Amino acid sequence: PLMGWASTADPLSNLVLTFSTKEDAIAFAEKNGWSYDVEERKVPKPKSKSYGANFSWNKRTRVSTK
Amino acid sequence: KVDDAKVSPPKRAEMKTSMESLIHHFKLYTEGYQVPPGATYTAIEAPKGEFGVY
Amino acid sequence: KTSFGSLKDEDRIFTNLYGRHDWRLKGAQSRGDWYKTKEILLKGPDWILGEVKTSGLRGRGGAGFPTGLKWSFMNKPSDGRPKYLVVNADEGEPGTCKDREIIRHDPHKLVEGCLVGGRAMGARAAYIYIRGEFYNEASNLQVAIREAYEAGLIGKNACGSGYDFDVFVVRGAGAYICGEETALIESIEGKQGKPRLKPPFPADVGVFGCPTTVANVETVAVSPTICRRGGAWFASFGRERNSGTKLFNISGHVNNPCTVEEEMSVPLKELIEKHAGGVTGGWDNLLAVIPGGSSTPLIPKSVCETVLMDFDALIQAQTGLGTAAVIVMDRSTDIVKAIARLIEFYKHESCGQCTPCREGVDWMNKVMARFVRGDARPAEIDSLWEISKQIEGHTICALGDGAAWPVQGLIRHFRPELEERMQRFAQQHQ
Amino acid sequence: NTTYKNLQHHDYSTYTFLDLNLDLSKFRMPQPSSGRESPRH
Amino acid sequence: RFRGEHALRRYPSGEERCIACKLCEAVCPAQAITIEAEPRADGSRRTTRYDIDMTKCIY
Amino acid sequence: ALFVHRDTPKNNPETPFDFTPENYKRIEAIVKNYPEGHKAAAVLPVLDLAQRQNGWLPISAMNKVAEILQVPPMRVYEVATFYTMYNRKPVGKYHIQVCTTTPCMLRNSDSILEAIQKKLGIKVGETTPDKLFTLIEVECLGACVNAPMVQINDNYYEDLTPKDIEEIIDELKAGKIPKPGPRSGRFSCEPAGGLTSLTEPPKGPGFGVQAG
C-alpha cells in the first residue's frame, strides 16, 4: 500500500527444481513429504511432409501461393 | 577486451551501427553467456593468502 | 581432327539466316523439313536417343547438362500421368538474340523438333514459352502453327500414323527468371514465377505433377536434323565432350555487330575480326572480352589473344561458356561501370525465394556504387571477394551464381584500375 | 543467299498472337484433369 | 564519472528519453528498478511506473 | 514504386469495366486450352487480354478476372504486382521502352537517352503531359545483337541515331508507323560483311541420311 508492489507471505513461492527423470522427481517428492501432481511428458508428434507433396497434381495438398 | 564478442560486450560505435553486435549486446545482458558444464577451481594470492574460488 | 575449326559451307545445320527465299512450310520442305520423318518416328524412341548420343549433343543455354542424359531420364515407363515437353524461348544473358533469329526466320524446324521430342520420350503435349517482349515474332509463330495445322499433318494423328501431338504457346510477362529451369514450370502453372527445389526433378514431378522436361530452342532446332541425317556427322566439328555447331554472336562493340554460325572451336581473333567487320579502334584498343553473356567472368587481353572458344577451354579459364554475347569492350568504357550496371540488372530481376542472392546482390549493388564513386578501402574490395565466395552455390538457381562470377572475374583481373580509382578519390577528397 | 528473306514478320499486328492461339485451338487433347476443377472448388 | 543521484535525461526540447525497455530492471542486481509500462494516446511506447529503491541500490 | 493500391478514383471499384462477347469467346478458348482441374492457370493470359483491351488494368478489371476465373482475387493481385508487362499506372497510346543493359549500354545507349530526353522533354521513368509518350528505360529484352533498342507497342527499333529519334517520334506524332525490323540496311540479324553465311540452295532430304 505504499509503492504498488506484490508482497506475499510465501517463502516457497519462488522455488524451482529442475530434474532429469520422473522417477527421481517422484522419489524426492515422496522423500521430503509433501504431495505432488504428475503431468506426463508430451513430445512433438512426428509427421510426414514433402515438397513434392506440396506440388501435387490431383491431391489437394497444394501450396497455392509460390 | 577480448575480440570474442560472444563473451565480452562490444563498444558503442559498433553497438549503435551493427546488427550482430546489437544482438550480442541485447542477449548478453539479458540472459548471460552460456558456460560449459564442469567443476573448476583456481586460487590466486590475495594479500591475506590463498584466495580460492571453486 | 581439325586445326581449331572454322565454317565450311553447306555444313550449316540450318540455312535461311534472315529474309531468304520464302517463309513457309513449302520453303521448309525446300530447305529440308518434313522429309522422311515417319520412318524415323516408327523405329522406336531408343533409336532416336541413340542417334542423339551418337551426335553427342552438349546442352545449350550455357548450362552444360547434355541432352542425351536428360532425355534418357525421360524414358520412364508411362503411368496414368501424361508426359509434357516445354520449349523454353526466353533470352536472358543481355546481349543475346540467340533464338530471336530462329523464331523470327524459321519456326518450322522448331515444329519438326518438338514433334521429334514428343515422340522420342513419350511426351504428349508441348507448351512453347515465348518471352513477352516478342509479340510480333509470337504472331509469326502463330501463323506458322496455323500453316502446320492447315497442312493437316500435326495436331491429331501426325505423319498419317495414329499419333496425336498438340503444341501450345504461352507468352512471357517479362523476366529473367522465367527462362530458368523450374520457375518456367511454375510460371506456366499460373502461380508467380519461382523455382522449385532440385532433388525432386522435373522428370519426376513437373507441370502440376507430371514427368515433363524443358528443351532449349537450339536443341529443338538441331534435333530433327540429327534424326534425318547421319550419325556423328554433327560430332566431327570440334572436340569429344562438346561437339557440333553453335551460334557465336557479337552483340556488342565491334564494327557491324552481328551473328554467325560456327563449329565448336574457333580461333578467337579470326572469330572477332575476320567475320564481323573489325574491332572498334583495332585489336589493341579493347580493354577486355566477356564470353558467355552476363553469367560469365571476364577474359582480359593477354588471355583473349590466345584462348580458343571451347567449353573445356573456358573450364580451364575458370569461366562458363554461353551464347551470343562473346564480345569485347573498349578501354574507353569503364568495366567497373559496365559490371555495376549488370549488377543493377541483377537486382532489378531476381525473385525473392532465397535469402543469400537477395541480400548479396543488395550489398554488391551498393558496394559497386561505392566503387564507381570510389568511396571505399581495399578491405572492402577483398570483402566483396569474400562475399562472392560466400554466395556461390548456396541458393536455388544460378542467378546468384551468375552474380557471383563477374565480381570474381573483376577481382581476379582488374585490380589496378580499382586501386587507381580509389587513389584518385583520395586525391579528390584530400 | 544475301537477301533478307524475312519482312514476313513486318505485318504483325498487336492482336495476332491471340489470333493464332485462337485459330490453332483444335486437335487439343483434354489437358488432363485432377479431382476437383480448381484448387478451391 | 562519479555515480550518485540517479537522474533522468530527456530529448532536446523533447519528450522523455526512456522507452521502458526493461533492460535496467533486467540487470539491476538488487532488483530496485520497478517498471510497469503502458503506451499513451499518441502511439509511442512509454511507461506507467518507474521506481528506484534507494535502499536496495548498491550503485 | 508504390506497390499498395490506395484507391484514388478513376480506380476505386467499381470503376465501370466490361469486355466484348468476342473477347469472351477468346476467354473460353483460353480456359479451354488448359486441362480441367486447374482452371487457375489462365490468369496471366486473361489479364493479358484485359491489358490489350484496355491499355492499363484497373482494380475493377482484377475483380472482373477473379469473378470470371472463380478464384480469390489475391492471386490476381500477386500476378499483377509480380511481372513487368502490366502497368497499373495509366499510360498513353504509345509506350516507350528504352532497353539498355550489357551490349546496349556498352554500345553507347546514353546518346539515345540524351536524344529521347531533349526531344521529348520529360525525364526518365516519368510520364508526359499528353498521351502516347510514357517513357521508361528498361532492362534486357533479348534483342541484343544491334544498337541499344526501343520497344513501342509490340514493335522494335534497332540501329538508332538521333535523326532516327527525330524521325520516329515525329512520325508517331503524325501517326505513320515505321518498320519493326532493323535499320542501316542488313534486313535481318545479319553478318554485315561479305556474306559469310551459306550461299548454295540447300539440298535437304535428298542426300545421304541413315535409318530414315
Add this chain to the structure above:
Amino acid sequence: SNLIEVFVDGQSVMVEPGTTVLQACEKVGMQIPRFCYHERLSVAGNCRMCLVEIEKAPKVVAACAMPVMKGWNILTNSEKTKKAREGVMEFLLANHPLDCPICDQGGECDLQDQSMMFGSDRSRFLEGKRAVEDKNIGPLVKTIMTRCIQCTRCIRFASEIAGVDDLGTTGRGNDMQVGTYIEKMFMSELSGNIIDICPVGALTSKPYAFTARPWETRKTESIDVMDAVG
C-alpha cells in the same frame, strides 16, 4: 522392411521412407536451426537456414525438404556448414532495423537467440538499410512490416489453414512487401493466431502491446474455457 540407414556424425539411426533429413535429425536430438519450416504447415525453403554439408557433395543443401536416400552421413558440425550459417545470419541482419528495445519479442525473438548461438559478432554493411512502412491489418493485431524477414510463414498459414487468401508477396528483389494490397482491414477467424506464427517481431498483439517483456512473467499450466475442446 521400410527402413533407411543414416549416420548422424557416426551415430546410426533408421529413417522412414519419404521423410526429411530434418525429422531424423530432430529424432536423434539435433535441432538444426530453422526459420521457414514449421510442423503445422507445409514446407517452404525460402529461409535457407537449414543448410548442412551432406557428404560427397560439393554443394550444401537444405534439410527441411531433402528426400532421404539409403545410407547417408550427415555432417552438422563441419567447417563450411558453420561458414554457411555465419553467412546466412549475416545476410538476415542487414535490412533489419534497430528496434530490439521497442520490439515486443525481446525475450522471445528468434534472430536474437540464433544470432547469439550461431552467427557472427562483428557486423558489416555500413550504409543502406531500407525500410518498409507498416500497414493496418486489424485492430486486434499490431503490425510493423519493416521487421518482416519475408519468411513466408503467415502466407502459408493463411492459404492452408485459414483459407482466406488475403496475404501475398508483392514485388521482386529486395522489395517484397508481404500483406494485403487493397487497404483492407484483414478480419477473419484465427487472426489472433498469427502473432504466434510470425517468428520475428513483425506481427504482435495490439491490446497487449507494451505492458511487459516475457522474462518477468511466470508461465503456468491451465485449461481453456468458452469452447468445449480445451
